[PDB]
Design a protein around this ligand. Structure first.
Ligand code: 3PH
Ligand code: Y01
Ligand code: Y01
Ligand SMILES: *[C@@H]1O[C@H](CO)[C@@H](O[C@@H]2O[C@H](CO)[C@@H](O)[C@H](O)[C@H]2NC(C)=O)[C@H](O)[C@H]1NC(C)=O
Ligand SMILES: *[C@@H]1O[C@H](CO)[C@@H](O[C@@H]2O[C@H](CO)[C@@H](O)[C@H](O)[C@H]2NC(C)=O)[C@H](O)[C@H]1NC(C)=O
Ligand SMILES: *[C@@H]1O[C@H](CO)[C@@H](O[C@@H]2O[C@H](CO)[C@@H](O)[C@H](O)[C@H]2NC(C)=O)[C@H](O)[C@H]1NC(C)=O
Ligand SMILES: *[C@@H]1O[C@H](CO)[C@@H](O[C@@H]2O[C@H](CO)[C@@H](O)[C@H](O)[C@H]2NC(C)=O)[C@H](O)[C@H]1NC(C)=O
Ligand code: HNX
Lengths: 464, 471
């Protein structure tokens, strides 16, 4: 009884494209224009985040073909740095990182799908919270049903969001095809470029939010048909498509609206639909919701597979990583993902957790790529189907260390709170993992609740 | 495996009847809970009240107009042509004005009626081509151009006292000519000297609207009587009218409050224009200690504020030696006023006041962007209410956006506010703690919330508190 590989090349392309293109292309440009000052600085920030994500994806393709086991970015750290940093990464990546990232996109889905009923108006908040929870519950039920159904969902919604962005891009092209330019003058487009790199790296963070999810096919390997070919071929095909669409969508945004027209706007896609369309301008918020639906589906998929792999190393309870026969899906891991995602619906503002934890999110990537170089030098007895040129990982490590050291130099009050939450897992590691020889007051109860959840969900252990 | 059972044990234990019924019951219970959450979202969505529909504003609803009567005195000598006016459009874009009432640039010799022509440009301003370039240059800066078509602007009687018909006949062709040229509106001043006045403005308004619905017509009187204004506003309602209705008085605040509220009552809460005159500065009617209070008042009343050139720096005509009061020299820099060198100062000029945060130009710029951006100041609702003996307090509120509260002290003693609201609608009732956005006088720090119970005001102070939609 195993997980029964189904992911094709086009399924992996759809997974990466649908998970990356979520909400950030419709929310973040105001935050980038606020910190860049000039539109040209915004476009070079978007292109820089694009090239940065492409370089990191090449390094993760080389890592995922080297080690080639599931649960990427956590198994790669467990292979090199032992058990305790892997558990700390798994702890943080569970608790704060995965349900908040899913709940943000679900909330943007619910907010933008209810915009035609409240055109010039704030949406009622609890209706949006309920619709977001409905989205999460429907998608986890679809994921608990079958894997082929979930890949069909991801395929359809990735194609839908691609055609939506193509429509927006061609509208921005026919606007500049009407012989005059609002923005994009060769001397005006750079007027307003502020400075103070400390006020530039915040625009870099706001752009790097929209590129999140670029390493999720590394989480969902061990289920790909022929991974040694179809993982880097999926990454190479997928991520250059995102950067081009992002810079063309920002360019189409700028030739409809002026600068402080966008700096004081609430939904720059809704205003774009209001300009180029009369009635039938609800198409654009409908399509934004359809993008965020597929992004939530892909993130739920990869999170369930990550907790599946983390249970197999003895770092999580063993009720997880139990497969249900005749469906062959990790049902308790999916239930555990959905429960946490619904649990983060009690916060009023959850966007202020991104700056609390960005330093750890890039520290783990930098640690994994340092471990990749150290593994290539220390242990050269592995088969490597792709081998990147060096000084791409070295430049990526230098850029990640630049982002970490700058985030400890402009806003050091949130990183301290983040580092305080990180070491709270250190009591948890020494209860369950390291502390064996537990009393019989605890082992029988854990066995009883495990077999009770087994009898409820009809799940067997893995082994095949 | 490690803390659980295996395949066969579970398949022969958890296959018994009851357990199958338990998991099917939990499945249908899950789907009924999902449908219950869907119904709970739907009945919350339909219970939300609705949201109001926007009034489809014009371009002159979204900011202030700027009157430049004498083009020679705006730039200065040697550059008083139409071409030099193109160089000031970046300064005019810093004031965020939406329109521009250029003075009468047509060829008028003197009180002879046969020689003047409203179709031709006077050669001391330029020609038609540098006017067409000016229109296209202002069109790129999002600034509209209104042309004053008052015929006899060099003379005492402004409408050619001899007869009335032919001088009103040439205006009819001038409207169609200059609308084809591409102007955005017209202005006619001194219509109290026009015989059969109310039945000519309707015809000119008809032609101006029949070209397009985005065309303006402004009329100007020197009247202060309310009934003479309403008589001109009987058959016309989309006509903008500038008068001397507020230039009368206002030593006390209850006079200005009654003057605003009686006009809004007798008109019917229609769209109006707020000014102090038709071609005069603010310093021609107010002392220098009331120039901030009236600038705070005119930017927050429900209408279009109209200003003359130099009202943002407090350009006083009587505060200098020999000079006409109809065309003072605009003080761009310190070297503006050429003769008597050493009469201007640093706080009297544009560039000297363009750096000081506690200046008058800074107050004008801080009001003129709030007027053109905030939704409850563009087409919001107005409500005045009773206050302390000498105050003027009112509230602007549109639907669910940020509510604005303005408090003004038109007197020379320190007053406590005492905002006994007691008559506002329940939608826009007062909160307990309102914020602060600006103040006319220095000695307040901006951004921290006060509370409107022990609210104390020093003389000639004005407050622009704000508070959000709540319950
Ligand atoms: C929730 C609905 C989902 C449906 C399926 C149920 C799945 C339940 C998953 C529960 C996951 C929550 C625990 C997260 C993992 C931490 C536990 C672990 O790593 O142990 C491996 C260890 C593996 O055991 P094995 O299965 O025998 O290999 O797990 C345990 O021994 C049992 C741990 C129970 C954890 C309950 C929550 C405890 C939170 C921490 C409380 C404080 C403890 C430290 C005391 C000092 C504090 C100052
Ligand atoms: C663009 C379309 C797909 C609309 C997407 C939203 C749909 C309204 C929802 C409601 C039910 C959902 C799914 C419910 C279960 C499956 C059945 C599945 O077909 C199978 O049974 C394959 C499983 C197998 O062969 O074993 C294909 C469609 C799918 C994904 C459905 C697609 C449509 C979903 C995502
Ligand atoms: C906090 C935890 C302990 C609660 C977990 C409870 C589960 C969320 C519930 C919801 C619906 C339940 C079950 C409803 C139907 C069954 C039977 C089975 O579905 C089938 O029809 C298998 C036969 C087939 O191949 O068609 C697999 C999924 C399962 C166990 C479901 C798994 C999840 C259950 C136990
Ligand atoms: C112009 O305004 C008049 C009343 O102010 C309206 O009716 C016009 O009256 C004039 C005589 O003064 C006629 O010459 C026009 O033919 C009338 N217009 C018609 C019948 O449409 C009318 O509201 C305005 N004109 C238009 C065209 O809207
Ligand atoms: C508007 O200005 C005129 C000119 O100063 C004021 O006086 C009128 O002058 C004309 C001729 O110049 C006379 O025919 C009128 O009879 C004068 N008006 C009166 C009331 O006698 C006129 O008073 C001013 N309007 C107001 C309201 O003050
Ligand atoms: C001024 O507004 C008030 C209400 O705010 C109205 O005054 C009413 O006028 C009618 C007839 O003129 C009287 O029958 C009512 O008793 C008045 N009510 C009040 C409360 O004063 C009216 O809209 C305006 N006043 C006038 C004279 O038009
Ligand atoms: C520009 O500043 C000077 C000095 O700061 C002002 O001169 C003051 O004028 C007030 C009233 O006019 C007097 O009470 C002060 O005693 C004067 N101070 C000095 C040092 O002379 C001048 O009035 C300011 N100009 C304007 C237009 O406000
Ligand atoms: N491209 C996306 C879009 O919706 O546009 C879709 C997917 C996706 C996945 C992961 C992600 O990471 C976010 C994140 C990073 C570091 C720390 C965090 C702490 C708390 C919460 C989130 C953190 C961002 C995005 C944005």
């Amino acid at each position: 009884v195993t997980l029964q590989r189904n992911i094709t090349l086009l399924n992996g392309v759809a997974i990466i494209v649908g998970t990356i293109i979520g909400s950030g292309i419709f929310v973040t440009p105001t935050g980038v224009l606020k910190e860049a000052g000039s539109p040209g600085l915004a476009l070079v920030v978007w292109a820089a985040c694009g090239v940065f994500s492409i370089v990191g994806a090449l390094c993760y393709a080389e890592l995922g073909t080297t080690i080639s086991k599931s649960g990427g970015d956590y198994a790669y750290m467990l292979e090199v740095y032992g058990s305790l940093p892997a558990f700390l990464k798994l702890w943080i990546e569970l608790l704060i990182i995965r349900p908040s990232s899913q709940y943000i996109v679900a909330l943007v889905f619910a907010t933008y799908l209810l915009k035609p009923l409240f055109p010039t108006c704030p949406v009622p908040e609890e209706a949006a919270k309920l619709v977001a929870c409905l989205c999460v519950l429907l998608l986890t039920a679809v994921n608990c049903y079958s894997v082929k159904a979930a890949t069909r969902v991801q395929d359809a919604f990735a194609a839908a969001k691609l055609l939506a962005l193509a429509l927006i891009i061609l509208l921005g092209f026919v606007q500049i095809g009407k012989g005059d330019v609002s923005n994009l003058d060769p001397n005006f487009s750079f007027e307003g470029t502020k400075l103070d790199v400390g006020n530039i790296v915040l625009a870099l963070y706001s752009g790097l939010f929209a590129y999140g999810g670029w390493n999720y096919l590394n989480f969902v390997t061990e289920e790909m048909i022929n991974p040694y070919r179809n993982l880097p071929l999926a990454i190479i095909i997928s991520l250059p498509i995102v950067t081009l669409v992002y810079v063309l969508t920002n360019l189409a945004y700028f030739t409809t609206l002026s600068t402080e027209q966008m700096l004081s706007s609430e939904a720059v896609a809704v205003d774009f639909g209001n300009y180029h369309l009369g009635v039938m301008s609800w198409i654009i918020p409908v399509f934004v919701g359809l993008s965020c639906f597929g992004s939530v589906n892909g993130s739920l998929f990869t999170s369930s597979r990550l907790f599946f792999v983390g249970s197999r190393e003895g770092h999580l309870p063993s009720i997880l990583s139990m497969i249900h026969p005749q469906l062959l899906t990790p049902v308790p891991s999916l239930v555990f993902t959905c429960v946490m995602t619904l649990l983060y619906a009690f916060s009023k503002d959850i966007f202020s957790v991104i700056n609390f934890f960005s330093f750890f999110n890039w520290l783990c990537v930098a640690l994994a790529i340092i471990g990749m170089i150290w593994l290539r030098h220390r242990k050269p007895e592995l088969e490597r189907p792709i081998k990147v040129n060096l000084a791409l990982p070295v430049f990526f490590i230098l850029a990640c260390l630049f982002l970490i050291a700058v985030s400890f130099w402009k806003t050091p009050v949130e990183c301290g709170i983040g580092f305080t939450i990180i070491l709270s897992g250190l009591p948890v590691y020494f209860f369950g993992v390291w502390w064996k020889n537990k009393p019989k007051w605890l082992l029988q109860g854990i066995f009883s609740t495990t077999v009770l959840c087994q009898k409820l969900m009809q799940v067997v252990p893995q082994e095949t | 495996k490690f803390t659980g059972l295996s395949k066969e044990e579970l398949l022969k234990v958890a296959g018994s009847p009851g357990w199958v019924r338990t998991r099917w019951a939990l499945l249908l219970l899950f789907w009924l809970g999902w449908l219950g959450m869907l119904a709970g979202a739907v009945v919350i969505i339909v219970r939300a009240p609705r949201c109001r529909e926007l009034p489809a504003q014009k371009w002159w609803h979204t900011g202030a107009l700027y009157r430049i009567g004498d083009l020679q005195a705006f730039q200065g000598h040697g550059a008083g042509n139409l071409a030099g006016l193109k160089g000031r459009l970046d300064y005019l874009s810093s004031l965020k004005v939406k329109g521009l009432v250029l003075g009468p640039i047509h060829k008028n010799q003197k009180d002879d009626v046969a020689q003047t022509d409203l179709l031709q440009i006077d050669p001391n301003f330029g020609s038609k081509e540098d006017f067409d370039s000016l229109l296209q240059s202002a069109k790129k800066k999002s600034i509209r151009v209104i042309l004053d078509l008052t015929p006899n602007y060099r003379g005492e009687n402004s409408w050619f006292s001899t007869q009335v018909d032919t001088v009103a006949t040439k205006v009819k062709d001038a409207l169609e000519f200059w609308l084809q040229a591409g102007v955005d509106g017209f202005q006619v001043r001194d219509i109290e000297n026009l015989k059969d006045a109310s039945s000519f403005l309707a015809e000119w308004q008809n032609i101006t609207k029949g070209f397009s619905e985005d065309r303006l017509l402004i009329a100007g009187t020197n009247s202060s009587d309310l009934q003479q204004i309403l008589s001109l506003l009987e058959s016309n309602k989309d006509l903008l009218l500038t008068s001397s209705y507020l230039s009368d008085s206002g030593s006390t605040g209850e006079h200005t409050k009654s003057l605003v509220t009686q006009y809004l009552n007798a008109t019917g809460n229609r769209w109006c224009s707020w000014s102090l005159s038709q071609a005069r500065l603010l310093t021609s009617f107010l002392p220098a200690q009331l120039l901030r209070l009236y600038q705070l008042m005119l930017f927050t009343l429900p209408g279009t504020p109209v200003f003359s050139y130099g009202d943002e720096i407090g350009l006083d005509a009587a505060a200098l030696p020999g000079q006409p009061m109809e065309a003072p020299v605009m003080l761009w820099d310190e070297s503006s006023f050429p003769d008597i060198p050493g009469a201007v100062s640093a706080n009297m000029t544009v560039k000297g006041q363009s750096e000081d945060p506690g200046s008058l130009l800074s107050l004008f710029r801080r009001l003129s962007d709030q007027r053109s951006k905030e939704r409850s100041l563009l087409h919001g609702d107005f409500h005045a209410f009773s206050a302390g003996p000498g105050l003027f307090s009112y509230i602007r509120h549109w639907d669910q956006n940020e509510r604005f509260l303005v408090v003004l002290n038109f007197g020379d003693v320190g007053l406590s506010a005492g905002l006994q609201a007691s008559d506002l609608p329940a939608s826009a009732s007062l909160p307990a703690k309102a914020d602060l956005l600006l103040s006319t006088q220095p000695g307040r720090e901006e951004g921290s919330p006060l509370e409107l119970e022990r609210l104390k005001l020093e003389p000639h102070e004005g407050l622009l508190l704000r508070f959000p939609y709540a319950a």
